[PDB]
Amino acid sequence: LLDLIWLEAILPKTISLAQMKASTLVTNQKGLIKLYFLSFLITILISMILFNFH
Amino acid sequence: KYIIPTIMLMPLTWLSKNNMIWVNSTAHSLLISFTSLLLMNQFGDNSLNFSLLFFSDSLSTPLLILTMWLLPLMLMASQHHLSKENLTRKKLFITMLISLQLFLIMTFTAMELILFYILFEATLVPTLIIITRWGNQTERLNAGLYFLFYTLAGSLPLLVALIYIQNTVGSLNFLMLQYWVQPVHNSWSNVFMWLACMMAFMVKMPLYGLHLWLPKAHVEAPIAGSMVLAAVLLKLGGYGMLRITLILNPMTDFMAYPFIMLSLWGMIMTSSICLRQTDLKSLIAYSSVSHMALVIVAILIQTPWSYMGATALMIAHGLTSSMLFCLANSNYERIHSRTMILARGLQTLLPLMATWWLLASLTNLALPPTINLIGELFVVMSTFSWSNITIILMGVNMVITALYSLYMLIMTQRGKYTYHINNISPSFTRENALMSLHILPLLLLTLNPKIILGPLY
Amino acid sequence: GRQGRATFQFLPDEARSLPPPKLTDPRLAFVGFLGYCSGLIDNAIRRRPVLLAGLHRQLLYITSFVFVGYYLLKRQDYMYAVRDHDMFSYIKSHXXXXXXXXXXXXXXXXXXX
Amino acid sequence: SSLPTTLDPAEYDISSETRKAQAERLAIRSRLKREYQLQYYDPSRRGVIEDPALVRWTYARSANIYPNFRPNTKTSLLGALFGIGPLVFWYYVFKTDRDRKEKLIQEGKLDRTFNISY
Amino acid sequence: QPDVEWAEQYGGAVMYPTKETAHWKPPPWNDVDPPKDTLVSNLTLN
Amino acid sequence: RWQEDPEPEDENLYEKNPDSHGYDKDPAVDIWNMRVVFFFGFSIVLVLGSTFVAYLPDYRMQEWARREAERLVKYREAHGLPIMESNCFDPSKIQLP
Amino acid sequence: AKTVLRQYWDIPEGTECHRKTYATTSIGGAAGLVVSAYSVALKTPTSFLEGVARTGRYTFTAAAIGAIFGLTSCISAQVREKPDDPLNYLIGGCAGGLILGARTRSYGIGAAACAYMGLTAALVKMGQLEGWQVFAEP
Amino acid sequence: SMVYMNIMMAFTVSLVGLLMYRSHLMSSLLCLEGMMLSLFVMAALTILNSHFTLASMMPIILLVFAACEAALGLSLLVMVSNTYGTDYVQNLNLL
Amino acid sequence: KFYIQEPPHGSPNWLKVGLTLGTSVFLWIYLIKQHNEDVLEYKRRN
Amino acid sequence: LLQVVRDHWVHVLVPMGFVFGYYLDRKNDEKLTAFRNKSLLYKRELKPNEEVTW
Amino acid sequence: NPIIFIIILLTIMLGTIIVMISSHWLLVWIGFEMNMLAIIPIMMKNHNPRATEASTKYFLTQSTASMLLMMAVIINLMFSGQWTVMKLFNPMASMLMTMALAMKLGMAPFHFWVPEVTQGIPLSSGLILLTWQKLAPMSVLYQIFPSINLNLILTLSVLSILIGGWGGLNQTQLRKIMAYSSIAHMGWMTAVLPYNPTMTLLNLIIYIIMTSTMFTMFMANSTTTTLSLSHTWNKTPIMTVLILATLLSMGGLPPLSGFMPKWMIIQEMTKNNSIILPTFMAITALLNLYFYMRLTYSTTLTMFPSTNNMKMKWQFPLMKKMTFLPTMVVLSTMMLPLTPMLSV
Amino acid sequence: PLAYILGEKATKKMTEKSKLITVDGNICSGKSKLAKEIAEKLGLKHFPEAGIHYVDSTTGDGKPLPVQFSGNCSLEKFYDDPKSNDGNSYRLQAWLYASRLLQYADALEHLLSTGQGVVLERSIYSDFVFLEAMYRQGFIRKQCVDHYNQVKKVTICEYLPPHVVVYVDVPVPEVQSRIQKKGNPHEMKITSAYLQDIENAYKGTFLPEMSEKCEVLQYSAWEAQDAEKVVEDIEYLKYDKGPWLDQNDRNLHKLRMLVQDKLEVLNYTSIPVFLPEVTVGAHQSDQVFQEFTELPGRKYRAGYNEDVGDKWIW
């Protein structure tokens, strides 16, 4: 329970989370210059309104 | 005087012919270990200074002598292993052990917090290569990955801590300079300042939590039971705890109170698991958690008695646990599986080794005063001044320390060995030499260990 | 910190060539070891027998790292002096910014155990 | 732990269908024995044999950490109660002893006269 | 000791299996070949 | 099937061929290594080394303070009134308020 | 928005509860729209049919994270004395991080995030002191 | 103030027009011409109103480097129509 | 072996060997003479 | 004389390397010469020999 | 290709010189677009479908990058009207300046082109010309170090190491790992720029040399982890030792001189009362190390990539700076820690 | 090799009365050896057919390496009587393809530098005939052929021009009697159906070889062993509108740079795809590579070695 499963678990949790959040950036947006440029319009809109610098 | 003879040991192995190698690496390291015992043992009223800070001095470090003593002892054990491999890789390997010992000389001598840390992490890379190559067992990569996953995630918080302290108060560099020390006022910003300095040495000094770093490195051994002595040096490599608690934060030790409690169950529950396990190396690996947990209990109390017991225990464990790994090496080189149930029977095949089994197992217990009793007894007497209830928890540990040694003995005293056709030859001349060169320094420290337990003693 | 009364073209200033240069320094010897080390692994990548005993183009490898390293250390001895000089001159000119406090035996709390 | 009398001549079928099953026990036993016997009585062996029963025995304890325990049930939380529980238990033991000691130092002296230690 | 099964698990595709990426085939060893089939290929006059 | 991997090696000599040896390959070098140079480090560093571990390095004023304390006990008892301890480091220093 | 984040450090100074919950949903809802904005660019099948469903699964949940974190902050303010504590808003982060496993039926991902969200949100309330600054000029 | 409210607006409209796609890769390069055209007018008004005289050569140089990109990038577009049948954003191979 | 089937390198270059051994000495003289000049410059300035 | 140089080419380097370390660390004493005769702890006016402490 | 390949290569060298030695705003504008015309022919080279796709994806992202940069130049005429590269003098133009330079570099939001451009490059000679190209936008950022807002630089530096640290975990392509270490290192670049503009130039020196040592050792043709696997036994075993010195140095390890940037970037930041950001830097840097952790196992282990075909003839590549530079890349932390002053 | 801007250039004092003439398609018996030896009047250099010992013969030093060190359990005698269960079959063919790629790279380098008529005995474009005939009967697994095609698609496309003149020899089905007449105990007792399938597959392989704008010429057994008839046909027939005719500045130099080093051309030959027949084991290959280092051939460098030459250390 403790020395092998539970006391380990804390950082294997962060390993499993890092490997799961890896797919949301690597496997996401399969090709297409359309999909990459569409996200660039949003980043300008965030910088103008949300993360406001005049 | 300890700079550029170990660096001069580097071209020795490359230049020497294929017939020699092992004869040169051992003989030109034993005379180097003689000079460490010759010069470093001298002390004045307080801490000296050998040179300007590239490598500084000794304050409470006879632990440097132990590394110089293991400088040829690792080469003794890896003789049957790496005998069938390439001659160029033999020259490559000995230099990697030398490089480990090179940075280990540096870390103990240098009285810095900045130069110490980067060479404390410079011992991590050679061990990584030593573990992940020549590993006899499968999934040795998990022993390599978690070696740098647990340590570096705890130690990189030192960069944000140590540089922060020197930006506020003078400079950490010279340490004897660092007596500009202001008492920590116990603020919420100072909470993580204390934690980041400790968590780096909560990994190499194994607690109950974050302790899985150790047994995986021992079960998936670097080399059989030969390069495990370097991992014993990494256990005592967390001696920065002696310096951080004393200098950087003496006032605020309210946060030390939960960490003693966490290591208090890192005494009983770490010894309970070390009773049923099948691997003979793991029965040393989990016992090494408990004996090094004694120091973590001691240091955080910060009483003068605990420092006397701790510094003794750092030297005590460095020669007793490493000796037990040499016994595990002698069993693994014959059977080629570290199963305790399978390898059963001494005296019928190994008569002389059985006496060396006793002088190594019983040292886990408090024998007639070697260094282990002197190490333990001062810590137990220090915990009573902290709190009266401690000996009830500490007394259970004293029972299971007998369940360490005798259980290792009984499972080897049972005379059978029916399935075993091997282990026909008793022992080599170098095999019994490992048993002597580990135990006889412990036997010589029975007489006067004044130059062992010495933080102002 | 940043450059103020200094200009580019020719790396040392020549106008501030007063400080003595590094003569047979341990810093020069370590780069000399790296110059030798670069003359060891060149026989390892390009397959040549014996790193210690091989072809003698290593003399170029030793000299180049020493030559570049000498002027690099000359830049180090210059820039550290100027950074210190501008620091000392700032205290001497303003005086009000850097305050001095002397002679104190102030009471502090004593810790138990 | 055994509850009634020591089980050896108690509770058994009187030579029914179990006799065919008991004969099957010796068939598998001798099958593993004969391959052991062939790899034992030769002088040209020299070396400890594998025996897969003990190899899988070590693998059952050392490995099977994350292939197992993938359904983290309420029983694992009950095991966690024995995990974190005792660590928080001593927090109300050591602190109560310390606040008893520290108050005795300041008001109504309880310190020893011949205490040169620590 | 590492074997052929360990190399297949760390095979050149996507490192770890994913539900989104499965049709993503591994590239050729050296210099990719274009789809040369179906082109203009010499226009005719009448 | 691997067609290249199946080639196991199992050769533990120890006694068969060299008769008396600590390690394999070259018996003449083995006697000079396993029995000579290992034992010179076993003799010099452990026996002649033991005359440096605890035997006369003076060592942080352990025996020096005995001659220092004995002359100070007789001095402050015959001439002085307090018995060697009363106030530490500060005789009438600057007060807190 | 920077104007909404500056309002977040003025309402807990008093004892206003009904406007504090709306201030947290305006941050969480907008931050929910930011995360969902990238998800539109990940090839949405059938435009303005499942793309609206992809916004509806993220923006509603993230605002509900802010809603519970907003509500539990007010419950912890009324019950027990001493308003400024890191432990006081640690339970608020735990309850706010509890419904991460409410998006999908698993009860394990949300339970693992309960300790992580509870500690990280407590650090924000720890960051009211001078010793914690994310961005600096000199 | 008055004119700059339209020519800056025309730049932002073309900025959307570049990054928005309907599979045609020719239209993106056509908008790159418009982007340089909008930059040409915005630079012209700043130099002509505030009589610089020296800076008048700068949009002429800008006009040269406008056509430098809008030809060498256009030549790569032809290479897509050599390897593949017709130019499309959807027609890709890279991962 | 005797370097059979046309050896690519036997190393009797003397063109590259003469320059590598040459310019290194030219670097040695250039560094010491400027160091001797700087030693005179350090004494003259201060 | 002729056989010793070929057989023991590396055997001399390590003890000679110790001598190099014995000499280099000794030469660091001249760098630390501040308050050698000064500072009241072991200070005494030496007459037969110049600079007692090294 | 004869002299014309060298002339094209020399105009990239000359192109960055116009960026370096400059005072005029349209002069650096030319310097960026001098590179745009000159990288593309080396991007093509071997007449590939991948090369055509990479160059078009490279151009359409970086042509828009320059035109966004020219907008910042024109707003510098709308307000103030001074054409000297020192300050933007605007809270609006500074936004369109930093984000345009982020497009040319491997910074967080405009990173999507970087891995797919690196895959389409035919040879190792062309792979250098992206790591060396990043000197040009960095040189401008050093010139305009004030008047640029923290809220839209430091957010782009923090996110880039986050997406860089997770962007190479699900990748086996050797080009793709180097492309995401590029995104990872750019976060360490721009984080220094407000907290003293110095050390950003030294961070380039460490990065450019350490990346050039990789591809010159990748002259023995390898595109995947499994293709670089057959190198331990079929090819030379000493080559695996020297790549080990470059793999481990790219991650944060103190015995190697790749820790020398991570030395001063944390040190300079901690001086200015910021501790919560350098903590986030070092922890995410372990994810960058983690790529090389699994990539060291291709060289340290056997891994069984034997292959029946064995090479008898010795390998003869270019190896121009493959010997001098890895010696400096492995050890310089003990050699020159005072080089901070010499560089900047 | 790198600086060709001076006197040394491609197609300079070359590519006139000098062409690659491949003599291939000998069915099973060594019939191509007689035709290549006879064609020595017009052609300057005639290379022998690649076998098991060719890889050590070229680039090494005269004498071939032993069977254990050169090709891991690879022998021509094993393929003479091919059998199932962990045999050679495919791994000898992969070694045979690597040797034939090596000899073609040397021949093309010999053609570009100093223009000479090169005669080759069975080239790369005849190798798939030798493989597919073995596949028709139960010898090679299906997955191994697809592994070969992956090497085929990469290695060939590096070379822009295939051949100038390709010689086709179609003998009678009674060629097994001619193989029995020849003094070879190993070559004898081979399958008659295998040799018949080799001639059948070659007929469908000669058609794309002729359509690839290379001058293909067919010869009979009666037309064979003629020094006058074969040489006159080679001089009269001129190569027109072929892939061999290319630009000397761009196409020829890139071909010469790729063929200059043997390791660069064979870099694509080593495939990362794991195959059980293509030798995957590293434990025995470690000692085999160590035995090659122990061997007094090369071991130390590309050219100079200890106890072999070395006039000077520098």
PDB file of N, CA and C in Angstrom, chain B residues 205-257:
ATOM      1  N   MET B 205      19.111  12.095   1.848  1.00  0.00           N
ATOM      2  CA  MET B 205      18.900  11.595   3.205  1.00  0.00           C
ATOM      3  C   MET B 205      17.454  11.084   3.264  1.00  0.00           C
ATOM      4  N   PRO B 206      17.258   9.754   3.107  1.00  0.00           N
ATOM      5  CA  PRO B 206      15.922   9.197   2.871  1.00  0.00           C
ATOM      6  C   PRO B 206      15.009   9.238   4.098  1.00  0.00           C
ATOM      7  N   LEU B 207      13.842   9.856   3.922  1.00  0.00           N
ATOM      8  CA  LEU B 207      12.803   9.934   4.950  1.00  0.00           C
ATOM      9  C   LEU B 207      11.880   8.713   4.860  1.00  0.00           C
ATOM     10  N   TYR B 208      10.590   8.928   5.115  1.00  0.00           N
ATOM     11  CA  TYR B 208       9.552   7.943   4.827  1.00  0.00           C
ATOM     12  C   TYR B 208       8.920   8.251   3.470  1.00  0.00           C
ATOM     13  N   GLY B 209       8.593   9.526   3.255  1.00  0.00           N
ATOM     14  CA  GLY B 209       8.184  10.033   1.947  1.00  0.00           C
ATOM     15  C   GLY B 209       9.405  10.418   1.132  1.00  0.00           C
ATOM     16  N   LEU B 210       9.286  10.284  -0.193  1.00  0.00           N
ATOM     17  CA  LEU B 210      10.374  10.535  -1.165  1.00  0.00           C
ATOM     18  C   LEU B 210      11.603   9.633  -0.935  1.00  0.00           C
ATOM     19  N   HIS B 211      11.347   8.401  -0.491  1.00  0.00           N
ATOM     20  CA  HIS B 211      12.407   7.452  -0.134  1.00  0.00           C
ATOM     21  C   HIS B 211      12.634   6.356  -1.185  1.00  0.00           C
ATOM     22  N   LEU B 212      11.737   6.276  -2.173  1.00  0.00           N
ATOM     23  CA  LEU B 212      11.796   5.275  -3.254  1.00  0.00           C
ATOM     24  C   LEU B 212      13.008   5.450  -4.188  1.00  0.00           C
ATOM     25  N   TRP B 213      13.657   6.613  -4.089  1.00  0.00           N
ATOM     26  CA  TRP B 213      14.918   6.917  -4.769  1.00  0.00           C
ATOM     27  C   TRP B 213      16.030   5.899  -4.467  1.00  0.00           C
ATOM     28  N   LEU B 214      16.070   5.420  -3.223  1.00  0.00           N
ATOM     29  CA  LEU B 214      17.136   4.532  -2.742  1.00  0.00           C
ATOM     30  C   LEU B 214      17.038   3.037  -3.146  1.00  0.00           C
ATOM     31  N   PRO B 215      15.901   2.342  -2.851  1.00  0.00           N
ATOM     32  CA  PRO B 215      15.867   0.888  -3.097  1.00  0.00           C
ATOM     33  C   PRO B 215      15.916   0.490  -4.574  1.00  0.00           C
ATOM     34  N   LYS B 216      15.351   1.328  -5.446  1.00  0.00           N
ATOM     35  CA  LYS B 216      15.392   1.113  -6.900  1.00  0.00           C
ATOM     36  C   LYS B 216      16.817   1.187  -7.458  1.00  0.00           C
ATOM     37  N   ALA B 217      17.633   2.066  -6.873  1.00  0.00           N
ATOM     38  CA  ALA B 217      19.053   2.198  -7.212  1.00  0.00           C
ATOM     39  C   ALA B 217      19.898   1.011  -6.727  1.00  0.00           C
ATOM     40  N   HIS B 218      19.405   0.306  -5.705  1.00  0.00           N
ATOM     41  CA  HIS B 218      20.106  -0.847  -5.126  1.00  0.00           C
ATOM     42  C   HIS B 218      19.661  -2.199  -5.700  1.00  0.00           C
ATOM     43  N   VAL B 219      18.354  -2.357  -5.934  1.00  0.00           N
ATOM     44  CA  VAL B 219      17.787  -3.569  -6.555  1.00  0.00           C
ATOM     45  C   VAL B 219      18.252  -3.666  -8.014  1.00  0.00           C
ATOM     46  N   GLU B 220      18.037  -2.595  -8.780  1.00  0.00           N
ATOM     47  CA  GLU B 220      18.661  -2.444 -10.093  1.00  0.00           C
ATOM     48  C   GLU B 220      20.046  -1.827  -9.881  1.00  0.00           C
ATOM     49  N   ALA B 221      20.958  -2.660  -9.376  1.00  0.00           N
ATOM     50  CA  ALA B 221      22.311  -2.255  -8.991  1.00  0.00           C
ATOM     51  C   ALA B 221      23.146  -1.813 -10.196  1.00  0.00           C
ATOM     52  N   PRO B 222      24.023  -0.794 -10.009  1.00  0.00           N
ATOM     53  CA  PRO B 222      24.963  -0.375 -11.057  1.00  0.00           C
ATOM     54  C   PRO B 222      25.839  -1.530 -11.553  1.00  0.00           C
ATOM     55  N   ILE B 223      26.593  -2.143 -10.638  1.00  0.00           N
ATOM     56  CA  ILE B 223      27.351  -3.370 -10.900  1.00  0.00           C
ATOM     57  C   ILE B 223      27.181  -4.303  -9.699  1.00  0.00           C
ATOM     58  N   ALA B 224      26.585  -5.470  -9.969  1.00  0.00           N
ATOM     59  CA  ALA B 224      26.337  -6.569  -9.008  1.00  0.00           C
ATOM     60  C   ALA B 224      26.200  -6.162  -7.526  1.00  0.00           C
ATOM     61  N   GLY B 225      27.341  -5.961  -6.866  1.00  0.00           N
ATOM     62  CA  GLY B 225      27.414  -5.422  -5.509  1.00  0.00           C
ATOM     63  C   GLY B 225      28.747  -4.734  -5.273  1.00  0.00           C
ATOM     64  N   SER B 226      29.201  -3.992  -6.283  1.00  0.00           N
ATOM     65  CA  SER B 226      30.535  -3.393  -6.297  1.00  0.00           C
ATOM     66  C   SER B 226      30.505  -1.863  -6.322  1.00  0.00           C
ATOM     67  N   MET B 227      29.645  -1.300  -7.171  1.00  0.00           N
ATOM     68  CA  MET B 227      29.500   0.154  -7.322  1.00  0.00           C
ATOM     69  C   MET B 227      28.389   0.728  -6.440  1.00  0.00           C
ATOM     70  N   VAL B 228      27.855  -0.128  -5.570  1.00  0.00           N
ATOM     71  CA  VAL B 228      26.835   0.234  -4.585  1.00  0.00           C
ATOM     72  C   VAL B 228      27.463   1.064  -3.455  1.00  0.00           C
ATOM     73  N   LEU B 229      28.773   0.896  -3.259  1.00  0.00           N
ATOM     74  CA  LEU B 229      29.559   1.655  -2.273  1.00  0.00           C
ATOM     75  C   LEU B 229      29.598   3.158  -2.586  1.00  0.00           C
ATOM     76  N   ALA B 230      29.489   3.495  -3.873  1.00  0.00           N
ATOM     77  CA  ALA B 230      29.357   4.879  -4.338  1.00  0.00           C
ATOM     78  C   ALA B 230      27.989   5.472  -3.988  1.00  0.00           C
ATOM     79  N   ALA B 231      26.958   4.623  -3.983  1.00  0.00           N
ATOM     80  CA  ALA B 231      25.605   5.010  -3.568  1.00  0.00           C
ATOM     81  C   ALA B 231      25.483   5.145  -2.045  1.00  0.00           C
ATOM     82  N   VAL B 232      26.361   4.450  -1.319  1.00  0.00           N
ATOM     83  CA  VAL B 232      26.527   4.618   0.134  1.00  0.00           C
ATOM     84  C   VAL B 232      27.175   5.982   0.419  1.00  0.00           C
ATOM     85  N   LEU B 233      28.106   6.384  -0.451  1.00  0.00           N
ATOM     86  CA  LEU B 233      28.742   7.707  -0.394  1.00  0.00           C
ATOM     87  C   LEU B 233      27.782   8.855  -0.725  1.00  0.00           C
ATOM     88  N   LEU B 234      26.770   8.567  -1.545  1.00  0.00           N
ATOM     89  CA  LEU B 234      25.708   9.527  -1.864  1.00  0.00           C
ATOM     90  C   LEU B 234      24.735   9.718  -0.700  1.00  0.00           C
ATOM     91  N   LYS B 235      24.552   8.664   0.102  1.00  0.00           N
ATOM     92  CA  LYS B 235      23.745   8.723   1.329  1.00  0.00           C
ATOM     93  C   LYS B 235      24.367   9.677   2.346  1.00  0.00           C
ATOM     94  N   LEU B 236      25.667   9.513   2.593  1.00  0.00           N
ATOM     95  CA  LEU B 236      26.438  10.426   3.448  1.00  0.00           C
ATOM     96  C   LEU B 236      26.822  11.732   2.731  1.00  0.00           C
ATOM     97  N   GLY B 237      26.525  11.802   1.431  1.00  0.00           N
ATOM     98  CA  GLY B 237      26.719  13.008   0.618  1.00  0.00           C
ATOM     99  C   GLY B 237      25.784  14.153   0.970  1.00  0.00           C
ATOM    100  N   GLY B 238      24.724  13.842   1.721  1.00  0.00           N
ATOM    101  CA  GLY B 238      23.800  14.843   2.252  1.00  0.00           C
ATOM    102  C   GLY B 238      24.232  15.374   3.607  1.00  0.00           C
ATOM    103  N   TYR B 239      25.500  15.785   3.694  1.00  0.00           N
ATOM    104  CA  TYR B 239      26.080  16.344   4.917  1.00  0.00           C
ATOM    105  C   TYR B 239      25.893  17.866   5.002  1.00  0.00           C
ATOM    106  N   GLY B 240      25.376  18.463   3.923  1.00  0.00           N
ATOM    107  CA  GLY B 240      25.046  19.895   3.871  1.00  0.00           C
ATOM    108  C   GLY B 240      23.974  20.313   4.864  1.00  0.00           C
ATOM    109  N   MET B 241      23.201  19.328   5.326  1.00  0.00           N
ATOM    110  CA  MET B 241      22.198  19.479   6.382  1.00  0.00           C
ATOM    111  C   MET B 241      22.821  19.902   7.720  1.00  0.00           C
ATOM    112  N   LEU B 242      24.048  19.439   7.975  1.00  0.00           N
ATOM    113  CA  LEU B 242      24.854  19.846   9.136  1.00  0.00           C
ATOM    114  C   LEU B 242      25.243  21.326   9.092  1.00  0.00           C
ATOM    115  N   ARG B 243      25.393  21.861   7.878  1.00  0.00           N
ATOM    116  CA  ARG B 243      25.857  23.235   7.656  1.00  0.00           C
ATOM    117  C   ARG B 243      24.723  24.250   7.475  1.00  0.00           C
ATOM    118  N   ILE B 244      23.641  23.827   6.821  1.00  0.00           N
ATOM    119  CA  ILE B 244      22.478  24.690   6.544  1.00  0.00           C
ATOM    120  C   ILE B 244      21.683  25.008   7.821  1.00  0.00           C
ATOM    121  N   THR B 245      21.393  23.975   8.613  1.00  0.00           N
ATOM    122  CA  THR B 245      20.640  24.107   9.871  1.00  0.00           C
ATOM    123  C   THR B 245      21.398  24.949  10.911  1.00  0.00           C
ATOM    124  N   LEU B 246      22.723  24.801  10.937  1.00  0.00           N
ATOM    125  CA  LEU B 246      23.593  25.515  11.875  1.00  0.00           C
ATOM    126  C   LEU B 246      23.765  27.002  11.538  1.00  0.00           C
ATOM    127  N   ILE B 247      23.983  27.304  10.257  1.00  0.00           N
ATOM    128  CA  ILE B 247      24.350  28.658   9.818  1.00  0.00           C
ATOM    129  C   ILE B 247      23.157  29.469   9.289  1.00  0.00           C
ATOM    130  N   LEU B 248      22.461  28.936   8.283  1.00  0.00           N
ATOM    131  CA  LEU B 248      21.439  29.692   7.539  1.00  0.00           C
ATOM    132  C   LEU B 248      20.157  30.003   8.311  1.00  0.00           C
ATOM    133  N   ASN B 249      19.685  29.047   9.113  1.00  0.00           N
ATOM    134  CA  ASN B 249      18.461  29.224   9.910  1.00  0.00           C
ATOM    135  C   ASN B 249      18.518  28.535  11.289  1.00  0.00           C
ATOM    136  N   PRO B 250      19.008  29.259  12.323  1.00  0.00           N
ATOM    137  CA  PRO B 250      19.048  28.708  13.684  1.00  0.00           C
ATOM    138  C   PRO B 250      17.813  29.004  14.550  1.00  0.00           C
ATOM    139  N   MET B 251      17.140  30.127  14.291  1.00  0.00           N
ATOM    140  CA  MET B 251      15.986  30.562  15.081  1.00  0.00           C
ATOM    141  C   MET B 251      14.718  29.775  14.738  1.00  0.00           C
ATOM    142  N   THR B 252      14.347  29.768  13.457  1.00  0.00           N
ATOM    143  CA  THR B 252      13.116  29.115  13.005  1.00  0.00           C
ATOM    144  C   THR B 252      13.342  27.622  12.745  1.00  0.00           C
ATOM    145  N   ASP B 253      12.944  26.814  13.727  1.00  0.00           N
ATOM    146  CA  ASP B 253      12.961  25.354  13.623  1.00  0.00           C
ATOM    147  C   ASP B 253      11.621  24.745  14.062  1.00  0.00           C
ATOM    148  N   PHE B 254      10.561  25.546  13.934  1.00  0.00           N
ATOM    149  CA  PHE B 254       9.182  25.104  14.144  1.00  0.00           C
ATOM    150  C   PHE B 254       8.719  24.226  12.977  1.00  0.00           C
ATOM    151  N   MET B 255       9.281  24.485  11.795  1.00  0.00           N
ATOM    152  CA  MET B 255       9.017  23.701  10.582  1.00  0.00           C
ATOM    153  C   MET B 255       9.826  22.400  10.522  1.00  0.00           C
ATOM    154  N   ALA B 256      10.826  22.285  11.397  1.00  0.00           N
ATOM    155  CA  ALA B 256      11.606  21.057  11.565  1.00  0.00           C
ATOM    156  C   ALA B 256      10.813  19.989  12.320  1.00  0.00           C
ATOM    157  N   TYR B 257       9.915  20.449  13.194  1.00  0.00           N
ATOM    158  CA  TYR B 257       9.062  19.606  14.044  1.00  0.00           C
ATOM    159  C   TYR B 257       8.184  18.563  13.300  1.00  0.00           C
TER     160      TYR B 257
END
